[PDB]
Design an enzyme around this catalytic site. Structure first.
Site, PDB file in Angstrom:
ATOM      1  N   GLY B 146     -13.930   5.590  11.673  1.00  0.00           N
ATOM      2  CA  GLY B 146     -13.071   5.330  10.529  1.00  0.00           C
ATOM      3  C   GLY B 146     -12.351   3.995  10.595  1.00  0.00           C
ATOM      4  O   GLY B 146     -12.231   3.302   9.589  1.00  0.00           O
ATOM      5  N   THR B 179      -6.075  13.755  16.684  1.00  0.00           N
ATOM      6  CA  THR B 179      -7.002  14.092  17.755  1.00  0.00           C
ATOM      7  C   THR B 179      -7.072  13.022  18.846  1.00  0.00           C
ATOM      8  O   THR B 179      -7.869  13.135  19.778  1.00  0.00           O
ATOM      9  CB  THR B 179      -8.422  14.332  17.201  1.00  0.00           C
ATOM     10  OG1 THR B 179      -8.836  13.193  16.435  1.00  0.00           O
ATOM     11  CG2 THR B 179      -8.442  15.567  16.312  1.00  0.00           C
ATOM     12  N   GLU B 183      -4.575   6.431  18.334  1.00  0.00           N
ATOM     13  CA  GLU B 183      -4.667   6.191  16.894  1.00  0.00           C
ATOM     14  C   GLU B 183      -3.759   5.055  16.374  1.00  0.00           C
ATOM     15  O   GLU B 183      -4.160   4.347  15.447  1.00  0.00           O
ATOM     16  CB  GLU B 183      -4.394   7.491  16.129  1.00  0.00           C
ATOM     17  CG  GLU B 183      -5.471   8.542  16.394  1.00  0.00           C
ATOM     18  CD  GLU B 183      -5.484   9.689  15.399  1.00  0.00           C
ATOM     19  OE1 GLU B 183      -5.762  10.830  15.822  1.00  0.00           O
ATOM     20  OE2 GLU B 183      -5.238   9.452  14.198  1.00  0.00           O
ATOM     21  N   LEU B 252     -12.197  -1.305 -11.749  1.00  0.00           N
ATOM     22  CA  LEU B 252     -11.577  -1.494 -10.441  1.00  0.00           C
ATOM     23  C   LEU B 252     -10.613  -2.674 -10.423  1.00  0.00           C
ATOM     24  O   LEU B 252      -9.547  -2.602  -9.812  1.00  0.00           O
ATOM     25  CB  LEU B 252     -12.647  -1.684  -9.363  1.00  0.00           C
ATOM     26  CG  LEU B 252     -13.528  -0.469  -9.075  1.00  0.00           C
ATOM     27  CD1 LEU B 252     -14.440  -0.737  -7.886  1.00  0.00           C
ATOM     28  CD2 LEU B 252     -12.671   0.764  -8.837  1.00  0.00           C
ATOM     29  N   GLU B 254      -8.737  -3.686 -12.666  1.00  0.00           N
ATOM     30  CA  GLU B 254      -7.494  -3.369 -13.357  1.00  0.00           C
ATOM     31  C   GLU B 254      -6.472  -2.744 -12.410  1.00  0.00           C
ATOM     32  O   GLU B 254      -5.266  -2.859 -12.630  1.00  0.00           O
ATOM     33  CB  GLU B 254      -7.763  -2.439 -14.542  1.00  0.00           C
ATOM     34  CG  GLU B 254      -6.626  -2.383 -15.547  1.00  0.00           C
ATOM     35  CD  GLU B 254      -6.997  -1.633 -16.810  1.00  0.00           C
ATOM     36  OE1 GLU B 254      -8.207  -1.478 -17.075  1.00  0.00           O
ATOM     37  OE2 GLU B 254      -6.078  -1.194 -17.535  1.00  0.00           O
TER      38      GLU B 254
END
Ligand SMILES: Nc1nc2c(ncn2[C@@H]2O[C@H](COP(=O)(O)OP(=O)(O)OP(=O)(O)O)[C@@H](O)[C@H]2O)c(=O)[nH]1
Ligand SMILES: Nc1ncnc2c1ncn2[C@@H]1O[C@H](COP(=O)(O)OP(=O)(O)CP(=O)(O)O)[C@@H](O)[C@H]1O
Ligand SMILES: Nc1nc2c(ncn2[C@@H]2O[C@H](COP(=O)(O)OP(=O)(O)O)[C@@H](O)[C@H]2O)c(=O)[nH]1
Ligand SMILES: [Ca+2]
Ligand SMILES: [Mg+2]
Ligand SMILES: [Mg+2]
Ligand SMILES: [Mg+2]
EC number: 3.6.5.-
Lengths: 54, 439, 423, 338
Positions: B146, B179, B183, B252, B254
């Site tokens: 991620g 987890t 992070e 998008l 906008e």
């Protein structure tokens, strides 16, 4: 307090209400960064295998 | 009609994506097998829903989406899930071993090996578009994939699609459902690298969603399933303007125009109301005034912070259901006299309002009760910088001792990147302070 | 499918390793034949992590049994689950290692090691995506300690990017076989600091104390000690063997537990210590943090926790688990380092161990573990200062300088723990 | 077992509060950097409010209201009163004030001159550094050789003078606002009096005009002649009002004081209330008042980090524990609720 740009359709409405007026890295450069990191991993692994060989 | 391509990265991105497309199909009357009896044009069309769905000759409505994860277990659930027929195999990309909650592993080590594959799958979706306007990218801050792979993907997307807008839906880390201890590292690293490649990013703090589920849905111990269906409703409210007939936030570009005056400051605060338990037998429906008033309560925000002690740069109100402009204005007038709403001097004090007559769709058997009206407020407030301050403090505590740093250097990342990333965040906090506070 | 390759070496290693496979085969519904007779599908969802699938839906442990003498491995094969192991995975010599690290590491072990690596390679080639390795052994003998650490070095050479994990049994004068155990353990710890990512420190002193003081066993046997170990091993591998979010694989566990490369030695804990009365969640949580439930014979109050992993097993309120775990941290926050935010992670698995309604397993990276290494170092020096019993090692070609280096490195490790205890 | 942290070592009030908490045996003090606290005794400057209320399993409380500085900064207090419709531009209990920025740098320098031309003794002050003059010429010339912002308000030329002594004074009231935004007035206030006779013809002397304890023990003798340390308490002051003016402290003065306290704090409540917030806050305030000849009460300023009278430290700090702290964290009235 005035409403402007009122637009209406079958699915809904939209508008704007005003309360008060006012007062990149190249493709080549990306690959160089990735290859540089790979070479550092390779160097570190080379040092490990050298150490184990000793 | 201009198409939007959704990209879901890592476990959080994929599972949230699965919840969103499930909701989208229910909202547009699309069956799990892809068929849509409402759509009279078979094999094609340029309706508003076609922004998110393409069409085959058989009449299957296929999501313009790519799912990417470095391990297969999460996406394998999509391949055998309820909406397995919805997607075709080319849209679902899986690797062998994941990034192990390591930004450097996701970005450099594994990212290098799979970035070309992902881009070619995206190209195939882009080649179907008559006028692609950009991408919607879903991912966590905290995961190795991620954080790490997303930042690489965002860089390459700016190269291969220079004129295309990019929006983010980002999951901000909360220890109650987190987890990994590292992070905060991953969050700062990915924010630093992605900052110049994202035009507008919607941060969702898992802490906020978790507490909303406990408080308003009476869920003692919220699961990812509970969290994602709530997040899915907010995401749907935000993207509804792209998928339905309307005149606000219809493209998008906008979003940036309406919510982001200053490029680096592109993190709008989302607030949603009402959130009501389906298990609650007797319920009284909330009015326009009440759900609008709820938009200025911290307990309903996607990120816990205090807008009273910041300044607004822009504000958008997105209504779904039985709402008329008259009631919106009467609600706003009352709230302005009873609440602290400070706009910056170089911006008009006002609201952009969008109303869609169709009330929120809820998943049958879900935790959310169906309501007659709901609203999502998107406000660019400097108060969201509180989230950066929290994150940067946790970063500072660990990095001062160089805790866990060797994991990142071991993947070929330089220790200097930590410092560079953190310095960028320091400048970001300073930017918010300059815009927001006085003396 | 992310496979783990299991290796057990020496007398202690094979006896504890055998018990481990007996316990988890029962948890996964695998009979001592390889046949599955369970009732839940949670048992098979991650079965491939430790088991290979053979003909006729048979499940075979991905285990390699190693020793420099046949005795213990003959006993394993004659054991209850003895028939479940792959016959080709029994690798043994005849000479023995005579409780001598040098024999295991440099002479007798050196002759056998290549045949072990052949079997290791055969198992690794079958893996869809190998995670890494887990080794069970003692540090006080010759084969497990000497040949075990030799194996680790050789494996790291062939698989440098894979995780290396060990369950290492630390010697104690309370439960001792020979006087040279501190020598063998010090030489081994040196190896472990460099070549493992995660090491569970299992102190025979703690195991004996638990059997005697808590379990009220008058005369604890190795069998009684191994009951505690196999239970601990089942608990710490739960997250690997069942569906879950936290520490689901060896590398994510290491990233969560190891802030500095050399400080990867964990204190394991377990509750309840094993009548018919189930333990409430507050009781499980309180006991799992109690020093009396620790397997390393170190007092956690004499140090600080860098990181902690806690695993709860059975049917229980996940809300109550969270509250109690937060309660422990918030009321003893002095014993958790401040510079690692949210350093305690909790997982919950629905499947409880055999014979128990509810269980809790504790894994701590505590600076108090320095007490274990300081204990070994003192016993080492007491002999080494007089060069006592050294001829057993110099006779195998070792030089005194190698002992000095091992001692210095372990003293360095102790110093590093002390640094972060004060930080 | 509750836990707390200390981040302001220079606070005499919360040093004593810290004592009492420990004396209960149910409170533990943690390191100042430990995030796992129930209670924060915060620092005066740049308190990290954004990091509060994000520790799962912990109810967190802090001894400051975020945003309360608007009451407690002289330039901010003037702006707040003139801008807020609740207080209005025509406020009767607050002296006519103007915010003046130095020219070397929302400024009312022009507005001040307009009313001035229309006794014209004004006082200059900022957030020692006070100039009292009857000529506006040297008032403005004083702020341009400083740097920061200043305020110019009417110097009350007709103060109530205590007898014997013919001396000026000011009233300090302590106010505790808890997490539920209940307003508590400490029943004990103090009279910071001057020990010198009031001279309306000598503004050059900054002694009988400034009732500050800093400028009564220093740069000023006699001191402690009439009352111990130039401090008169309410029992004596009330007895004086009865004997000399045939009235009571409650009627002539405290009624106005309570009104002013209520007005100020209720005005900023929606801005600072932590009612539906992820962390809770309370705060102790020091209100300073001025009384004129006609027994009219004037608000001078509000202090965000006040000290207390030595005699009253024990009672007030205990009251803080019972009302502000133990209400949120119960263990195993001296206040008047407004
Ligand atoms: N809201 C929500 N958060 C999630 C979900 N899955 C994971 N997270 C959060 O995301 C962070 C973990 O990152 P993941 O997305 O699981 O990791 P990943 O992107 O798959 O990367 P690796 O697994 O490290 O390769 C933690 O903060 C989780 O709380 C989800 O389904 N919903
Ligand atoms: N408009 C006015 N009329 C009469 N006297 C005034 C006045 N403004 C201020 N004073 C006097 O000046 C003194 C100090 O005023 P000010 O409150 O600005 O200083 P200060 O903030 O340092 C006191 P503290 O901080 O201890 O509460 C007061 O004791 C008061 O008697
Ligand atoms: N807990 C436990 N410890 C053992 C067992 N067998 C031996 N030990 C310990 O291991 C050390 C002896 O090593 P051992 O494994 O017998 O030697 P090896 O066969 O050469 O590896 C001593 O410290 C013993 O106390 C056992 O079954 N359980
Ligand atoms: Ca169509
Ligand atoms: Mg993942
Ligand atoms: Mg033996
Ligand atoms: Mg003051």
């Amino acid at each position: 307090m005035e409403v402007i740009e009122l637009n209406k359709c079958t699915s809904g409405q939209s508008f704007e209400v005003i309360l008060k007026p006012p007062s990149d890295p190249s493709l080549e450069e990306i690959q160089k960064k990735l290859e540089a990191a790979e070479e550092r991993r390779k160097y570190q692994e080379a040092e490990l295998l050298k150490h184990l060989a000793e | 009609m201009r198409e939007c391509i959704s990209i879901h990265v890592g476990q959080a991105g994929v599972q949230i994506g699965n919840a969103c497309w499930e909701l989208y199909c229910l909202e547009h009357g699309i069956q799990p097998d892809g068929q849509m009896p409402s759509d009279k044009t078979i094999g094609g069309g340029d309706d508003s829903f076609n922004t998110f769905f393409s069409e085959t000759g058989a009449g299957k409505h296929v999501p313009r989406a790519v799912f990417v994860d470095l391990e297969p277990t999460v996406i394998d659930e999509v391949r055998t899930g309820t909406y397995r027929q919805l997607f075709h195999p080319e849209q679902l990309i899986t690797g062998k071993e994941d990034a192990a909650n390591n930004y450097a592993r996701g970005h450099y080590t594994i990212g290098k090996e799979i970035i070309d594959l992902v881009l070619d799958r995206i190209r195939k979706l882009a080649d179907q578009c008559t006028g692609l306007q950009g991408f919607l990218v879903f991912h966590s801050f905290g995961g190795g994939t991620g954080s790490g792979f997303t930042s690489l993907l965002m860089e390459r997307l700016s190269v291969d699609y220079g004129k295309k807008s990019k929006l983010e839906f980002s999951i901000y880390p909360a220890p109650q459902v987190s987890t990994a201890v590292v992070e905060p590292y991953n969050s700062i690293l990915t924010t630093h690298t992605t900052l110049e490649h994202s035009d507008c990013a919607f941060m969702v703090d898992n802490e906020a969603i978790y507490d909303i589920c406990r408080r308003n849905l009476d869920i003692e111990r919220p699961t990812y399933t509970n969290l994602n269906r709530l997040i899915s409703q907010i995401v749907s409210s935000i993207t509804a303007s792209l998928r339905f007939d309307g005149a606000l936030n219809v493209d998008l570009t906008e979003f940036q125009t309406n919510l982001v005056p200053y490029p680096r400051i592109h993190f709008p605060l989302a607030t949603y109301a009402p959130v009501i338990s389906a298990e609650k037998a007797y319920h009284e429906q909330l009015s326009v005034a009440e759900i609008t008033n709820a938009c200025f309560e911290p307990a309903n925000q996607m990120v816990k912070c205090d807008p009273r002690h910041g300044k607004y740069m822009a504000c958008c109100l997105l209504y779904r259901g039985d709402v008329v402009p008259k009631d919106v204005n009467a609600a706003i007038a009352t709230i302005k006299t009873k609440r602290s709403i400070q706009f910056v001097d170089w911006c008009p004090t006002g609201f952009k309002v969008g109303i869609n007559y169709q009330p929120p769709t809820v998943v049958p058997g879900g935790d959310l009760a169906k309501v007659q009206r709901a609203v999502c407020m998107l406000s660019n407030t400097t108060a969201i910088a509180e989230a950066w301050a929290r994150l940067d403090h946790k970063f500072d505590l660990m990095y001062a001792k160089r805790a866990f740093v060797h994991w990142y250097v071991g993947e070929g990342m330089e220790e200097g990147e930590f410092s560079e990333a953190r310095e960028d965040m320091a400048a970001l906090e300073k930017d918010y302070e300059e815009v927001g506070v006085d003396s | 499918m992310r496979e783990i390759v299991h290796i057990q070496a020496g007398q202690c290693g094979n006896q504890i390793g055998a018990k481990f496979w007996e316990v988890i085969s029962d948890e996964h519904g695998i009979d001592p034949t390889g046949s599955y007779h369970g009732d839940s599908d949670l048992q098979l969802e991650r079965i491939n992590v430790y088991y290979n699938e053979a003909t006729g839906n048979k499940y075979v442990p991905r285990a390699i049994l190693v020793d420099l003498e046949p005795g213990t491995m003959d006993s394993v094969r004659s054991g209850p689950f003895g028939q479940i192991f792959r016959p080709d995975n029994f690798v043994f010599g005849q000479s023995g290692a005579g409780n001598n690290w040098a024999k295991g590491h440099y002479t007798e072990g050196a002759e056998l090691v290549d045949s072990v690596l052949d079997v290791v390679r055969k198992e690794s080639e079958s893996c869809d995506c190998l995670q890494g390795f887990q080794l069970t052994h003692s540090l006080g003998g010759g084969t497990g300690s000497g040949m075990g650490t030799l194996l680790i070095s050789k494996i790291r050479e062939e698989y440098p990017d894979r995780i290396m994990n060990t369950f290492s049994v630390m010697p104690s004068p309370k439960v001792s076989d020979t006087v040279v155990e501190p020598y063998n353990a010090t030489l081994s710890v040196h190896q472990l600091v460099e070549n493992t990512d995660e090491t569970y420190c299992i102190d025979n002193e703690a195991l004996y104390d638990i059997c005697f003081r808590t379990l009220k066993l008058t005369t604890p046997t190795y069998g009684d000690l191994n009951h505690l170990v196999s239970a601990t091993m089942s608990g710490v591998t739960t997250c690997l063997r069942f569906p879950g979010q936290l520490n689901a694989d060896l590398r994510k566990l290491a990233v969560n537990m190891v802030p500095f490369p050399r400080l990867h030695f964990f204190m394991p804990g377990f509750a309840p210590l094993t009548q018919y009365r189930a333990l409430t969640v507050p009781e499980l949580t309180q006991q799992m943090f109690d020093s009396k439930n620790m397997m390393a014979a170190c007092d956690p109050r004499h140090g600080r926790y860098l990181t902690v992993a806690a695993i709860f097993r059975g049917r229980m309120s996940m809300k109550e688990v969270d509250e109690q775990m937060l309660n422990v941290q918030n009321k003893n926050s002095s014993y958790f380092v401040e510079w690692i935010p949210n350093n305690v992670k909790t997982a919950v698995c629905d499947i409880p161990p055999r014979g128990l309604k509810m269980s809790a397993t504790f894994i701590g990276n505590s600076t108090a573990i320095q007490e274990l290494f300081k204990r070994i170092s003192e016993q080492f020096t007491a002999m080494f200062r007089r060069k006592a019993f050294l001829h057993w090692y110099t006779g195998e070609g070792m030089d005194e300088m190698e002992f000095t280096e091992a001692e210095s490195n372990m003293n360095d490790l102790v110093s590093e723990y002390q640094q972060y205890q004060d930080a | 077992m509750y836990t707390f942290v200390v981040r302001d070592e220079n606070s005499s009030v919360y040093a004593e509060v810290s004592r009492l908490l420990l004396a209960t045996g149910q409170w533990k003090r943690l390191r100042k950097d430990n995030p796992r606290f129930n209670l924060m005794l915060g620092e005066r400057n740049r308190l990290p409010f954004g990091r509060l209320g994000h520790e799962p399993g912990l109810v967190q409380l802090v001894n400051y209201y975020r945003g309360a500085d608007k009451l407690c900064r002289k330039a901010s207090l003037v702006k707040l009163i003139k801008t807020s419709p609740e207080l209005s531009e025509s406020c009767t209990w607050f002296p006519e004030s103007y915010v003046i920025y130095p020219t070397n740098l929302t400024d009312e320098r022009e507005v001040f001159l307009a009313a001035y031309n229309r006794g014209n003794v004004w006082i200059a002050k900022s957030s020692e550094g006070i100039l009292i003059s009857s000529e506006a010429s040297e008032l403005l010339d004083f702020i341009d050789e400083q740097g920061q912002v200043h305020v110019i308000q009417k110097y009350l030329e007709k103060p109530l003078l205590l007898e014997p002594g013919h001396r000026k004074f000011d009233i300090r009231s302590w106010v505790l606002v808890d997490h539920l935004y209940n307003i508590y007035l400490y029943r004990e206030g103090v009279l910071r009096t001057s020990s010198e006779p009031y001279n309306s013809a000598n503004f050059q002397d900054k002694t009988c005009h400034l009732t500050n304890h800093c400028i009564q023990k220093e740069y000023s003798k006699n001191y402690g002649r009439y009352e111990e340390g130039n401090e008169m308490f309410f029992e004596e002051f009330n007895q004086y009002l009865m004997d000399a003016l045939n009235t009571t402290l409650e009627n002539s003065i405290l009624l106005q004081i309570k009104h002013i306290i209520r007005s100020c704090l209720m005005c900023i409540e929606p801005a600072i209330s932590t009612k539906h917030l992820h962390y809770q806050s309370f705060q102790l305030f020091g209100f300073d008042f001025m009384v004129d000849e006609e027994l009219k009460v004037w608000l001078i300023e509000v202090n965000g980090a006040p000290a207390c009278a030595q005699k009253l430290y024990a009672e007030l700090c205990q009251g803080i524990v019972d009302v502000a702290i133990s209400s949120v964290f119960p263990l195993a009235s001296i206040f008047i609720k407004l």
